[PDB]
Amino acid sequence: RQTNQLQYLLRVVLKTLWKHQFAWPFQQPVDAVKLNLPDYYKIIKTPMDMGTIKKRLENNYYWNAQECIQDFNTMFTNCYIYNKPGDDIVLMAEALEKLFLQKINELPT
Ligand SMILES: Cc1cc(F)cc(C)c1Oc1ccc(C(C)(C)O)cc1-c1cn(C)c(=O)c2cc(-c3cnc(C4CCCC4)[nH]3)oc12
């Protein structure tokens, strides 16, 4: 249930992604009412965002680092599922994904 890693995810991975210029549409859940997307919550069975991941790291939700990494990935794949390729939100998620994977490669064991 590695804690060096969970701590790394919070202070380094999440911190870096959260500062990114493209982070803002992923810092909270997709408000399907505001954005007028009635199908979103039927299509996306496991919504995810960095708001929720942050809360989970700050409140001892995660069993281990892999469970948290799945959530980061779910956020990205949720975005690629729902939206057409080429859409701006997809380019944004793609940039965030490069960076996420970079930072994951320097993870302590
Ligand atoms: C990044 C971006 C740029 C824009 F010019 C317009 C939007 C809506 C936009 O996305 C969002 C803006 C605000 C919010 C808030 C903060 C209110 O929850 C969310 C999004 C947004 C985030 N994520 C992860 C998404 O997957 C989608 C998807 C959409 C979206 C809204 N309308 C669409 C489609 C369906 C109608 C034709 C375009 N997709 O908006 C978001």
Swiss-Prot record:
Disease: Cornelia de Lange syndrome 6: A form of Cornelia de Lange syndrome, a clinically heterogeneous developmental disorder associated with malformations affecting multiple systems. It is characterized by facial dysmorphisms, abnormal hands and feet, growth delay, cognitive retardation, hirsutism, gastroesophageal dysfunction and cardiac, ophthalmologic and genitourinary anomalies. CDLS6 inheritance is autosomal dominant.
Top-level taxon: Eukaryota
Free-text note regarding domains: The NET domain mediates interaction with a number of chromatin proteins involved in transcription regulation (NSD3, JMJD6, CHD4, GLTSCR1 and ATAD5). The C-terminal (CTD) region mediates interaction and recruitment of CDK9 and CCNT1 subunits of the P-TEFb complex. It is also required for maintenance of higher-order chromatin structure.
Job description of the protein: Chromatin reader protein that recognizes and binds acetylated histones and plays a key role in transmission of epigenetic memory across cell divisions and transcription regulation. Remains associated with acetylated chromatin throughout the entire cell cycle and provides epigenetic memory for postmitotic G1 gene transcription by preserving acetylated chromatin status and maintaining high-order chromatin structure. During interphase, plays a key role in regulating the transcription of signal-inducible genes by associating with the P-TEFb complex and recruiting it to promoters.
Similarity comment text for this entry: Belongs to the BET family.
Crosslinked residue numbers (Glycyl lysine isopeptide (Lys-Gly) (interchain with G-Cter in SUMO2)): K42
Location of this chain's protein in the cell: Nucleus; Chromosome
Domain Bromo span(s) in chain numbering: 1-107
Coiled coil: none
Protein name (Swiss-Prot/TrEMBL): Bromodomain-containing protein 4
Miscellaneous section: JQ1, a thieno-triazolo-1,4-diazepine derivative, and I-BET, a benzodiazepine derivative, have been tested on tumors with success. Treatment with GSK1210151A (I-BET151, a I-BET derivative) has strong effets on mixed lineage leukemia and promotes myeloid differentiation and leukemia stem-cell depletion.
Annotated site (Acetylated histone binding): N83
Natural source organism: Homo sapiens (Human)
Record's signal peptide: none
Tissue expression from the record: Ubiquitously expressed.
Subunit details: Interacts with p53/TP53; the interaction is direct. Interacts (via CTD region) with CDK9 and CCNT1, acting as an associated component of P-TEFb complex. Interacts with RELA (when acetylated at 'Lys-310'). Interacts (via NET domain) with NSD3, CHD4, BICRA and ATAD5. The interaction with BICRA bridges BRD4 to the GBAF complex. Interacts (via NET domain) with JMJD6 (via JmjC and N-terminal domains); the interaction is stronger in presence of ssRNA and recruits JMJD6 on distal enhancers. Interacts with NSD3. Interacts with NIPBL. (Microbial infection) Interacts with bovine papillomavirus type 1 regulatory protein E2. This interactions may serve for the tethering of viral genomes to host mitotic chromosomes allowing successful partitioning of the viral genome during cell division.
PTM info: Phosphorylation by CK2 disrupt the intramolecular binding between the bromo domain 2 and the NPS region and promotes binding between the NPS and the BID regions, leading to activate the protein and promote binding to acetylated histones. In absence of phosphorylation, BRD4 does not localize to p53/TP53 target gene promoters, phosphorylation promoting recruitment to p53/TP53 target promoters.
Residue numbers of the full-length protein present here: 58 to 166 of 1362
